[PDB]
Amino acid sequence: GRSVDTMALWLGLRAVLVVAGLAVLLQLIRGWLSSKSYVFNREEIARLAKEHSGLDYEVAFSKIIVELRKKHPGHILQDEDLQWVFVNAGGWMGSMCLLHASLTEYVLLFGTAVDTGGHSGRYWAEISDTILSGTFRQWKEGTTKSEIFYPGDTIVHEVGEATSVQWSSGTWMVEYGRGFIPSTLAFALADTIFSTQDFLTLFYTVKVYSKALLLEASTHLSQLG
Amino acid sequence: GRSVDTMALWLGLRAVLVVAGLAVLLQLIRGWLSSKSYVFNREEIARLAKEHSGLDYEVAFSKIIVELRKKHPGHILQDEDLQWVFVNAGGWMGSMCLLHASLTEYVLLFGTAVDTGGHSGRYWAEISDTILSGTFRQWKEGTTKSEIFYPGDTIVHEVGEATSVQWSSGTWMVEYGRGFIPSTLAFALADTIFSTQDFLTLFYTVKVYSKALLLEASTHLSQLG
Amino acid sequence: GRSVDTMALWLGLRAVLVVAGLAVLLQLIRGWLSSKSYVFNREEIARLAKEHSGLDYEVAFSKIIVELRKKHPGHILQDEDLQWVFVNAGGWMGSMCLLHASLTEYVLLFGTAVDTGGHSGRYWAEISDTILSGTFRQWKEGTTKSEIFYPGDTIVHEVGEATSVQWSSGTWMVEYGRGFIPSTLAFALADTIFSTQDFLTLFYTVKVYSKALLLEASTHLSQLG
């Protein structure tokens, strides 16, 4: 009767429960025990972006790239490899210009020229966004109220945290990520696979990521010999 | 030539047509013949929520939970099992606090602190939402115009109906569902599987559902002996 | 160590790269070499829609359908086969009324009664939208700025181009598509498969497409004999 169907549904739900829980456990294990060698730190990136947040955001972009190259030679992509690529993730749409990426860190310019919003993703990485222009509304898990952030502010999405994110048209920011960067890739690509079907954008995305990894390997080789 | 390719495409479309049609038919068969034993009714929930819709929505939440426990002992989750869980479904993002769930009914608090919107889902269940705060825009199938609803109003999403739904930031409501509740689960989880990749949220969701089912079974056992 | 994991990740990224690149190449090959026999042209559709864009959009809809039937008998669906069907694609939600479809062309009425937005899709087809009412914000790839278009304006989404699109509530337009129309179908259906789970909407969609193809075949047969 209804009791048997309730029992069966409960058994299936418990199966899904243990699957999802062990997936979370494996994410934690891969992340906490991942290597932690860092070229940048989030305070450096945030201070650099905040200093230029009063400029036009594209002038700021350029000045930030020049300063990052000056202070971290061999770790920022060259001009020929810079490209704006759409990012469809968690139900929102923006675009990125990747400057640096390794297994443990990334640096990029991010933003959107449309009003958009959705899920932030949940992964073993600490992400920080410093607003150059626009507005960034963040809604944290377990609460019924959200906060707006403005140019000059830095939002820190912490390890294992999930939020709702919402950007107004014309919102541009500098983003630094630290942790187990591969664990973000799935989230970064899901809407491309299951929603937009935009395989040229996927091509561009994996292309620039591979170029950033190759730059880091080349610099590591040149500095060890 | 083009005639043969047109014929082939038409054949494939007819295949998809009969597949989708028989899926709809099976949904109807599972739903209409599902059991219909009810602890609540939608008018009771709607009147209770409308009475408190002039309060702050969190005060209303608390008073509604207390009254539901008083009038339906053994059918509302205890305080230790109440939790705000994100809900990513149909392209929109909100959050729920489940109070009751069985095979045939559910009761929850729902809302969002971001502007969001998307598909309502289509399933064999009658859903009713009573607005405590915010605005709820509903766009029904087969029409070119939408309607806004305000605090104190109840929206009834009827069995087999599909709509577009849109909520402004700070919109909170009391939701009651009646029908074949499992048939909603797929819709409730799809964006988590194929968009957000947030497996800890999936864990939380199946956890609270399983707790609600266990409460209902425990109460059924205590009342039959 | 970290060097080996970096190498492995780079190898996997290169695999994804060549897969996506050859998918794009196959899309280009199927599209460029597809047949190019056309019943309409985009200037005709755009001029007809622009002429009536000062009317109420539903009066415009009707007058446009009457004129299209008068000028292209046997290529527009009859009244009994006209239906508003929800379209969930690329993270946005609208609705369409298909008037014409073949392997190489389509004509439909499109719009939304909710604020929505997302990815435009990327396929080997040239799409043109003439706004009857509302606003259409378009954000092109490789730029950090978007443009708003108003009633009477035509937006041309070109072959292989990807954009972000955003419509305000009450935005209605006339859409003409030219190219390899099947290559759009995946994008048109993805959110239904992986997000909304709305199989009755999928039924309606493949039903009207099949009816349009059958009309075109019937007219081709009646005109060749």
mmCIF file of C-alpha atoms in Angstrom, chain C residues 6-149:
data_model
loop_
_atom_site.group_PDB
_atom_site.id
_atom_site.type_symbol
_atom_site.label_atom_id
_atom_site.label_comp_id
_atom_site.label_asym_id
_atom_site.label_seq_id
_atom_site.Cartn_x
_atom_site.Cartn_y
_atom_site.Cartn_z
ATOM 1 C CA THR C 6 49.734 19.410 -13.984
ATOM 2 C CA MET C 7 50.908 17.321 -16.957
ATOM 3 C CA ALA C 8 47.927 14.967 -16.607
ATOM 4 C CA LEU C 9 45.435 17.832 -16.379
ATOM 5 C CA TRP C 10 47.020 19.436 -19.449
ATOM 6 C CA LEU C 11 46.660 16.167 -21.382
ATOM 7 C CA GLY C 12 42.983 15.894 -20.440
ATOM 8 C CA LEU C 13 42.387 19.524 -21.402
ATOM 9 C CA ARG C 14 44.013 18.902 -24.797
ATOM 10 C CA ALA C 15 41.712 15.908 -25.289
ATOM 11 C CA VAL C 16 38.657 18.053 -24.552
ATOM 12 C CA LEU C 17 40.144 20.721 -26.843
ATOM 13 C CA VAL C 18 40.455 18.476 -29.884
ATOM 14 C CA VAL C 19 37.007 16.946 -29.258
ATOM 15 C CA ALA C 20 35.314 20.352 -29.095
ATOM 16 C CA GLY C 21 37.306 21.626 -32.066
ATOM 17 C CA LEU C 22 36.346 18.720 -34.285
ATOM 18 C CA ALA C 23 32.711 19.126 -33.169
ATOM 19 C CA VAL C 24 32.876 22.764 -34.300
ATOM 20 C CA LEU C 25 34.503 21.645 -37.556
ATOM 21 C CA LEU C 26 31.718 19.132 -38.211
ATOM 22 C CA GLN C 27 29.118 21.824 -37.481
ATOM 23 C CA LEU C 28 30.792 24.092 -40.039
ATOM 24 C CA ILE C 29 30.960 21.290 -42.618
ATOM 25 C CA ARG C 30 27.303 20.290 -42.200
ATOM 26 C CA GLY C 31 26.217 23.924 -42.324
ATOM 27 C CA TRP C 32 28.192 25.481 -45.174
ATOM 28 C CA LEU C 33 27.413 22.538 -47.465
ATOM 29 C CA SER C 34 23.728 22.397 -46.500
ATOM 30 C CA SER C 35 21.175 23.260 -49.162
ATOM 31 C CA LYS C 36 20.149 26.892 -49.600
ATOM 32 C CA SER C 37 16.660 26.988 -51.150
ATOM 33 C CA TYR C 38 14.648 29.811 -49.583
ATOM 34 C CA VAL C 39 10.944 30.713 -49.579
ATOM 35 C CA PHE C 40 11.395 33.976 -47.612
ATOM 36 C CA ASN C 41 14.161 36.500 -47.061
ATOM 37 C CA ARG C 42 15.004 38.324 -43.864
ATOM 38 C CA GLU C 43 14.403 41.810 -45.297
ATOM 39 C CA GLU C 44 10.829 40.855 -46.255
ATOM 40 C CA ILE C 45 10.024 39.536 -42.773
ATOM 41 C CA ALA C 46 11.738 42.485 -41.062
ATOM 42 C CA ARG C 47 9.942 45.104 -43.184
ATOM 43 C CA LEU C 48 6.571 43.415 -42.613
ATOM 44 C CA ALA C 49 7.107 43.293 -38.850
ATOM 45 C CA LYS C 50 8.492 46.836 -38.666
ATOM 46 C CA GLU C 51 5.464 48.186 -40.535
ATOM 47 C CA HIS C 52 3.146 46.832 -37.829
ATOM 48 C CA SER C 53 5.423 47.426 -34.823
ATOM 49 C CA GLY C 54 3.393 50.511 -33.888
ATOM 50 C CA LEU C 55 0.261 48.417 -33.400
ATOM 51 C CA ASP C 56 -0.572 46.400 -30.327
ATOM 52 C CA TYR C 57 1.708 43.403 -30.669
ATOM 53 C CA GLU C 58 -1.206 40.932 -30.936
ATOM 54 C CA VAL C 59 -2.895 42.937 -33.698
ATOM 55 C CA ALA C 60 0.511 43.010 -35.385
ATOM 56 C CA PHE C 61 0.808 39.223 -34.950
ATOM 57 C CA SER C 62 -2.516 38.698 -36.704
ATOM 58 C CA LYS C 63 -1.833 41.131 -39.558
ATOM 59 C CA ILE C 64 1.614 39.624 -40.135
ATOM 60 C CA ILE C 65 0.176 36.097 -40.303
ATOM 61 C CA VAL C 66 -2.517 37.184 -42.768
ATOM 62 C CA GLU C 67 0.020 38.921 -45.009
ATOM 63 C CA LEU C 68 2.449 35.976 -44.884
ATOM 64 C CA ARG C 69 -0.346 33.603 -45.894
ATOM 65 C CA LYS C 70 -1.388 35.924 -48.717
ATOM 66 C CA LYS C 71 2.149 36.257 -50.096
ATOM 67 C CA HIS C 72 3.304 32.656 -49.441
ATOM 68 C CA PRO C 73 0.285 30.347 -49.745
ATOM 69 C CA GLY C 74 0.984 26.803 -48.628
ATOM 70 C CA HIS C 75 3.942 27.768 -46.415
ATOM 71 C CA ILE C 76 2.225 29.080 -43.254
ATOM 72 C CA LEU C 77 0.527 26.810 -40.732
ATOM 73 C CA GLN C 78 -3.262 27.014 -40.526
ATOM 74 C CA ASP C 79 -5.096 28.454 -37.525
ATOM 75 C CA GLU C 80 -5.869 25.035 -36.004
ATOM 76 C CA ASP C 81 -2.105 24.336 -35.811
ATOM 77 C CA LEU C 82 -1.040 27.639 -34.237
ATOM 78 C CA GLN C 83 -0.111 27.336 -30.568
ATOM 79 C CA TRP C 84 1.930 29.234 -27.991
ATOM 80 C CA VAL C 85 4.613 26.868 -26.681
ATOM 81 C CA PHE C 86 7.081 27.680 -23.927
ATOM 82 C CA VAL C 87 10.747 27.748 -24.964
ATOM 83 C CA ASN C 88 13.376 27.121 -22.288
ATOM 84 C CA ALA C 89 16.821 27.532 -23.798
ATOM 85 C CA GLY C 90 20.217 28.834 -22.714
ATOM 86 C CA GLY C 91 18.946 29.769 -19.257
ATOM 87 C CA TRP C 92 16.105 31.983 -20.522
ATOM 88 C CA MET C 93 12.370 31.333 -20.833
ATOM 89 C CA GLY C 94 10.086 32.644 -23.561
ATOM 90 C CA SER C 95 7.412 31.297 -25.854
ATOM 91 C CA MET C 96 6.962 30.807 -29.576
ATOM 92 C CA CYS C 97 4.205 30.422 -32.126
ATOM 93 C CA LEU C 98 5.692 28.601 -35.109
ATOM 94 C CA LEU C 99 4.364 29.723 -38.501
ATOM 95 C CA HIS C 100 6.800 28.027 -40.895
ATOM 96 C CA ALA C 101 9.646 25.540 -40.726
ATOM 97 C CA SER C 102 11.738 23.467 -43.119
ATOM 98 C CA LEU C 103 15.298 22.164 -43.208
ATOM 99 C CA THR C 104 16.583 25.586 -44.301
ATOM 100 C CA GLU C 105 14.191 28.218 -42.888
ATOM 101 C CA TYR C 106 11.802 28.983 -40.090
ATOM 102 C CA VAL C 107 9.387 31.777 -39.177
ATOM 103 C CA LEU C 108 7.868 32.240 -35.742
ATOM 104 C CA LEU C 109 6.457 34.747 -33.302
ATOM 105 C CA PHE C 110 8.548 34.932 -30.135
ATOM 106 C CA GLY C 111 8.446 36.730 -26.850
ATOM 107 C CA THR C 112 8.176 36.770 -23.110
ATOM 108 C CA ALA C 113 5.917 38.166 -20.404
ATOM 109 C CA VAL C 114 8.677 37.844 -17.773
ATOM 110 C CA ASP C 115 12.081 39.480 -17.434
ATOM 111 C CA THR C 116 14.549 36.849 -18.636
ATOM 112 C CA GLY C 117 17.933 36.368 -20.259
ATOM 113 C CA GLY C 118 20.764 34.015 -21.051
ATOM 114 C CA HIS C 119 22.743 32.503 -23.882
ATOM 115 C CA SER C 120 21.647 33.014 -27.497
ATOM 116 C CA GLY C 121 22.955 29.676 -28.720
ATOM 117 C CA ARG C 122 25.629 29.132 -31.363
ATOM 118 C CA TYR C 123 24.722 27.282 -34.564
ATOM 119 C CA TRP C 124 25.036 27.431 -38.351
ATOM 120 C CA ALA C 125 21.981 29.597 -38.933
ATOM 121 C CA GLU C 126 21.314 33.302 -39.424
ATOM 122 C CA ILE C 127 18.517 34.453 -37.084
ATOM 123 C CA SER C 128 16.789 37.831 -37.283
ATOM 124 C CA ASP C 129 14.390 39.317 -34.727
ATOM 125 C CA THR C 130 12.237 42.393 -35.354
ATOM 126 C CA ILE C 131 10.888 43.879 -32.136
ATOM 127 C CA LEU C 132 7.165 44.602 -31.993
ATOM 128 C CA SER C 133 7.215 45.546 -28.307
ATOM 129 C CA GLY C 134 9.529 45.595 -25.315
ATOM 130 C CA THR C 135 13.316 45.788 -25.224
ATOM 131 C CA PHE C 136 16.059 43.437 -26.437
ATOM 132 C CA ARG C 137 19.523 43.766 -24.897
ATOM 133 C CA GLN C 138 22.296 42.051 -26.868
ATOM 134 C CA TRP C 139 25.842 41.503 -25.580
ATOM 135 C CA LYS C 140 28.273 40.327 -28.242
ATOM 136 C CA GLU C 141 31.198 37.992 -27.662
ATOM 137 C CA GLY C 142 34.572 39.603 -27.095
ATOM 138 C CA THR C 143 33.167 42.887 -25.791
ATOM 139 C CA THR C 144 32.413 44.348 -22.367
ATOM 140 C CA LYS C 145 29.384 46.406 -23.417
ATOM 141 C CA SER C 146 25.838 45.635 -24.501
ATOM 142 C CA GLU C 147 23.237 47.385 -26.646
ATOM 143 C CA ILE C 148 19.484 47.883 -26.181
ATOM 144 C CA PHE C 149 17.088 47.611 -29.114
#
